[PDB]
Design a protein around this nucleic acid. Structure first.
Length: 66
RNA sequence: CCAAGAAAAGGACUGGAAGAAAUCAUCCAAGUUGGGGACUAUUUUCUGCCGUAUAGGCAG
């Protein structure tokens, strides 16, 4: 599957699994293939890590929030 | 009431030295473009005079 790795400093201080994995943990990576009407909005530095398991489109819970 | 709310990666640099791609080599043969035709239409430039005068100047 498409994936990448997230690093943790001091693995022994986070948990059994993170230590066993040497501080490198794999996650999924699935980016996109790129009435009131709001046009032209720009966002700087959005969080691309939706949940600890998946990278890609920002969490939908955040848009409902907005 | 947006995995909520706040965050300065900054500083210093010297990759340099030498060099030999050459020898030969043949594109040829024939070939049929071809017969017809309204640019003048509802358009404006017409009439006298000076002067040796198709020169050169003026009144309608």
């Amino acid at each position: 599957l498409q994936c990448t790795y997230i690093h943790h400093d001091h693995p022994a201080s986070v948990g059994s699994l993170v230590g066993a994995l040497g501080g490198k943990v794999a996650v999924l990576d699935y980016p996109p293939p790129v009435y009131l009407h709001l046009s032209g909005l720009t966002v700087y530095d959005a969080s691309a890590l939706a949940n600890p398991y998946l990278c890609g489109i920002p969490s939908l819970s955040a848009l409902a929030g907005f």
